[PDB]
Amino acid sequence: PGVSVRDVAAQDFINAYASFLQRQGKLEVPGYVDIVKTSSGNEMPPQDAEGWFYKRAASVARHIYMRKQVGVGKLNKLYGGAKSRGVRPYKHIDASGSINRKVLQALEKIGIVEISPKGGRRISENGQRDLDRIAAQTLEEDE
C-alpha cells in the first residue's frame, strides 16, 4: 500500500523502535544513564533501566519527523511535567537539557537527524527512511 508514521498507533509504534534500536547496538549512550532523574521535576529515574534511552530515542525522532525542526529547549518543555514542590502547588518545569541534547547527537552520529539551518535539528533524509520501514514492521502486528 504505502505506509507512514502517521498511519501507526503512537505507543505500540514507538516501543517497536525501542525493540529495534535496543537489538541493533549502535547507540553511543553517554554512559551516565544509571542515575539521571530526567528532570529536576521528577522524583525518580525511569524504571526500564537497561534501556529507556531507546524508548526516549524512539520518541526522540517521531517528534522530530512530524515537524520542521526543534532545539534542545523545546524537548525539555515536552517531557518536563509537573513538579510537586512538596507542600507548595504543582508547577511545570522543563526536563533535563543534556539527557536530550545528546540523545540528539548520540543518534545523529548514527544519522537520523540533521543539524538544521534556521536553528534546530531537522529529520534526516536517511532517517526519513528509517521511516516507513518503521511500522511496515508494526503493521505486521495485525498483518
Binding site: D34, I35, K37, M44, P45, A49, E50
Partner: protein, 145 residues
C-alpha cells in the same frame, strides 16, 4: 516477566547493617529502613552490583549482599559521583562521605553540637529547639513541642 517458583531459599526475615528487612517486600524497595537511605541512592546501587530488582527480598542469594554494602560503605572507589551523597566537603577533611547507620543519628549531633560549640546563631536556635531556617514562628508549629 513470567512466574517462577523457587525453593526455600526464600527467608522471611534477615537483619543486616544493624537493620531488619522483610523478605516479602521488594529488594529495590525495602532497603530503606536503614538511615541515610533514599529510594534513589538505593535504586542506583543494585545493578551497579549486578542484581536484578524485579524480585523480592528473602531472595537474591547472599554472595552479592556481602558486597552490595562495600558499594555503599565505599561508594566512590566504585563509581558513584560526589554530588549523590549526604556529606561532601564534609566539614573538616574535605572528603566526601555517605553516612548510613545509627551513625547518621550520630553525624547529625557532630554538626549540631559544632554550631553550639561555636556560638553560631543557628546553634543557639537548635539548642533552644526551634525552627532554624528562618520560618515565621508565631502561628506555626505549636503543639508537638
Amino acid at each position: 516477566s513470567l512466574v517462577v517458583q523457587e525453593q526455600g531459599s526464600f527467608q522471611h526475615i534477615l537483619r543486616l547493617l544493624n537493620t531488619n528487612v522483610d523478605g516479602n517486600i521488594k529488594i529495590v524497595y525495602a532497603l530503606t529502613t536503614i538511615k541515610g537511605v533514599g529510594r534513589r541512592y538505593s535504586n542506583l546501587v543494585c545493578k551497579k552490583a549486578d542484581v536484578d530488582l524485579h524480585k523480592r527480598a528473602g531472595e537474591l542469594t547472599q554472595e552479592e549482599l556481602e558486597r552490595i554494602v562495600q558499594i555503599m560503605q565505599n561508594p566512590t572507589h566504585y563509581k558513584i559521583p560526589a554530588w549523590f551523597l549526604n556529606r561532601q566537603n564534609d566539614i573538616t577533611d574535605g572528603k566526601d562521605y555517605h553516612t548510613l547507620a545509627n551513625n547518621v543519628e550520630s553525624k547529625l549531633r557532630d554538626d549540631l553540637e559544632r554550631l553550639k560549640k561555636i556560638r553560631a546563631h543557628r546553634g543557639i536556635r537548635h539548642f533552644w529547639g526551634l525552627r532554624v531556617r528562618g520560618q515565621h514562628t508565631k502561628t506555626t508549629g505549636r503543639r508537638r513541642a
